[PDB]
Ligand binder design. Structure first.
Ligand SMILES: O=C(O)[C@@H](COP(=O)(O)O)OP(=O)(O)O
Lengths: 462, 462
């Protein structure tokens, strides 16, 4: 049972919009919207979306496993050894938000202050004393972006696993000599850093120049969660506000995916005429180039939707029905929709590019979609008494911590290691006003709901 | 009753070190150390200090008022109008942490997300609708450091008031025409930005080239809090760990101030021989140039303590008894004292340069001294039922908010406006492990105390 199995199981359920059935439904943690800061829904005038892992949630482990295979195939074709072909994606290893230390070749799970929670070199989990050899203070400076790369997106899950597979393979292959900062193969030295760069380049290539998009679109049922409640929720949002799409993807891909997500023999509700995905949006913007989008952005372009090419020149005209934009900036959206930042609820899965930057740069309200939560909630609930045991204790503490963490996977929970919260968890609490396993959970709350969080008090104020 | 009156009242009290008298004492909020994150004192191997507003707490409003007078005198001498001489420092206006908007000439009190809590143009407090004219989303991008300057230090209190005095004077003087971004005086245009720069330059000049230091040192009793418990606490720290001083000040000034702080006819306890301030430190570093100190730093120099000049050249020798260093970096301290970051408790008043940067860059443990807390606690306690009233209500809400805030001053509490926490309050919670009105409050806790904060849980985990 992957998180996308949980999500698709929920998607297969028709909507019962009886006011009491809705209240009853959002009692289950799985269908709730979780609140970091209060948000009066009646003040929200525009709902904005990212596509990838928001509207189009890719099925797991199938989509990660396809990315992994194509990245491996790309590395082998540029001259990495044949043995790479014998790797197979393992969804029980990677947790999102890990840091790759490019100097020493370690994956690290860290808290918000750069304290090390987990260190693995390949598939060897390094304990306390040995980690102090490389990290004397058990601490990394995460502003050292040349050395440390944070694998924060769901697109980075295959490469998280692949980095560990590579370190493991080269360490154990007698053709290579292991050094502190990489591997010697006779007169060739491959540093962890240049290995990491090859991996990152091959992932980029696979998405932009390779076969990933082609293979996705030829089997959408296999790769993409589909839900009859999607048109229903978007149509209800459009009744009370404007709705926009701002995606990094190009028009052709977006049109293929979105067509699929809306491909029902009815519109919003069963019985209603089907309508094209585009009619659900007051504004559609592709090639957004987020996070730059939330600063200077790029020049505003117009898509020729017949060819899928951009028209030549900067677009200087008004918002017209049927027009599709490319590039631009967050100010474009505000100007064209007549919105102030605080009137906008922006819905995305990228805790940096989407959510952090629209909050810090523009004061947008934010809803983070966290697909893994659909399964982390099930673990959190039926290891209730394991965390409670941990909480009661403050040697047994390290053991309980370990067994709590293993229930999630080899790299533990997205949100913690025992009683120590992750960097990812702290970015969520600080920058996501609202969050959930799916934005569909909004359907379970009335139009003008006040999501409420308790007022925060300092220690001297308590 | 200023906060430094509270502090000096407490300093005049001899230490009763009876174990039960200590427990009883730290029951009072005024003598407590407040905990944002747990800290086992037994793990602390080095205690590090800043001097200014930490060891040497300048008396208020006297010291601010002296800075204000000398800054005014400096502005007048470079050609600002004579009317400036009729300004008088008013300690009831400025609150620390305000933002000066150099485009529009406003002081702003903001939360951690850049939302505006208070806007004043000169001495006119601008209400909701009028503020939306300049701040359509009631929001500033605080990463716009060219436009916005944050007045975060106690040294910035005189200039906070002076900026408002200047805007007020030029607005109401018929020689000048008020414009959106400054003042026209015939064929001369003075922008708020260049006015701000003049003020900032004159404050800098007053500290580095003017008479502020001279006037301080000629009347130390008037300007600097002195406490017999200081030598006592430092001596107790030295029994269990190393103690260091790392200050931005030069040697001559530091020697004058520190000599005064230790000028008792006894050492640590009454009855004991007096010892020189320098014997209380395993390492003394002046001209630290923080915050750069916590990165590359500067070249390590040696002070010639006879002349107060630097010896010529980079110092390459060991830590020797009696040596005084200049410049260097945080790594110098760690290397010479044989400390890891987490073994260090760094004690300072600058929530950015001291505390933020040693935490983020080096993983040091942090103790923030917040002098105003010595008085904000007294207001928090006897407006108990005013905040409680505010808490019960969630038009009356705006009124209660206003009357709560006025008890603190015109720009309200350092920590909030009603139920909305300030940027400053959020920087404290996130980067200060421990905080208090004075670091002397450490004297009330045993050697190996565990300061404890409850574990943090996300909303879905609660
Ligand atoms: O969260 C962030 O975006 C940064 C910046 O904080 P601000 O200076 O923008 O408040 O804090 P970090 O997590 O790196 O300590």
């Amino acid at each position: 049972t992957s998180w996308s199995d949980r999500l698709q199981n929920a998607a297969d359920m028709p909507a019962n919009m009886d006011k009491h059935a809705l209240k009853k439904y959002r009692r289950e943690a799985y269908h709730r919207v979780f609140v970091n800061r209060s948000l009066a829904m009646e003040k929200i005038k525009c709902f904005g979306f990212n596509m990838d892992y928001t509207l189009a949630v890719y099925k797991s482990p199938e989509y990660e496993s396809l990315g992994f295979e194509l990245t491996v195939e790309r590395l082998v074709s540029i001259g990495y050894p044949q043995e790479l072909l014998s790797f197979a994606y393992d969804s029980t290893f990677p947790t999102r938000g890990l840091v790759f230390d490019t100097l020493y070749g370690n994956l690290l799970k860290v808290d918000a202050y750069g304290n090390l929670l987990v260190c693995a070199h390949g598939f060897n989990f390094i304990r306390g004393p040995e980690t102090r050899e490389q990290y004397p203070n058990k601490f990394i400076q995460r502003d050292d972006t040349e050395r440390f790369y944070i694998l924060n997106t769901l697109f980075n899950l295959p490469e998280t696993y692949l980095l560990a597979c590579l370190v493991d393979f080269f360490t154990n292959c007698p053709r290579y000599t292991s050094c502190e900062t990489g591997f010697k193969d006779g007169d060739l030295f491959m540093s962890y850093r240049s290995m990491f760069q090859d991996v990152r380049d091959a992932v980029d290539w696979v998405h932009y120049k390779g076969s990933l998009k082609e293979k996705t679109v030829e089997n959408l049922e296999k790769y993409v969660v589909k839900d009859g409640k999607l048109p229903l929720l978007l149509s209800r949002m459009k009744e009370v506000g404007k709705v926009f799409l701002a995606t990094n993807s190009d028009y052709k891909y977006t049109d293929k995916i979105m067509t699929y997500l809306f491909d029902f023999p009815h519109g919003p509700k069963p019985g209603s005429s089907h309508r094209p995905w585009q009619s659900y949006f007051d504004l559609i913007l592709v090639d957004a180039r987020k996070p730059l989008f939330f600063g200077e952005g790029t020049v505003l372009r117009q898509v020729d939707t017949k060819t899928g090419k951009l028209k030549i020149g900067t677009y200087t005209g008004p918002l017209q029905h049927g027009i599709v934009y490319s590039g631009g900036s967050s100010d474009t959206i505000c100007d064209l929709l007549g919105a102030k930042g605080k009137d906008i609820l922006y819905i995305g899965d990228h805790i940096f590019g989407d959510i952090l930057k629209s909050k810090k740069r523009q004061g947008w309200r934010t809803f983070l979609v966290i697909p893994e939560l659909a399964q982390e909630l099930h673990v959190w609930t039926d290891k209730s008494s394991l965390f409670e045991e941990l909480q009661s204790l403050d040697r047994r503490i390290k053991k309980v911590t370990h067994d709590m963490d293993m229930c999630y996977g080899m790299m533990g929970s997205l949100f913690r290691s025992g009683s120590r919260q992750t960097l990812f968890a702290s970015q969520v609490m600080r920058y996501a006003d609202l969050y959930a396993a799916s934005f569909i959970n909004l359907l379970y709350y009335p139009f003008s709901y006040l999501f409420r969080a308790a007022h925060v008090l300092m220690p001297h104020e308590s």
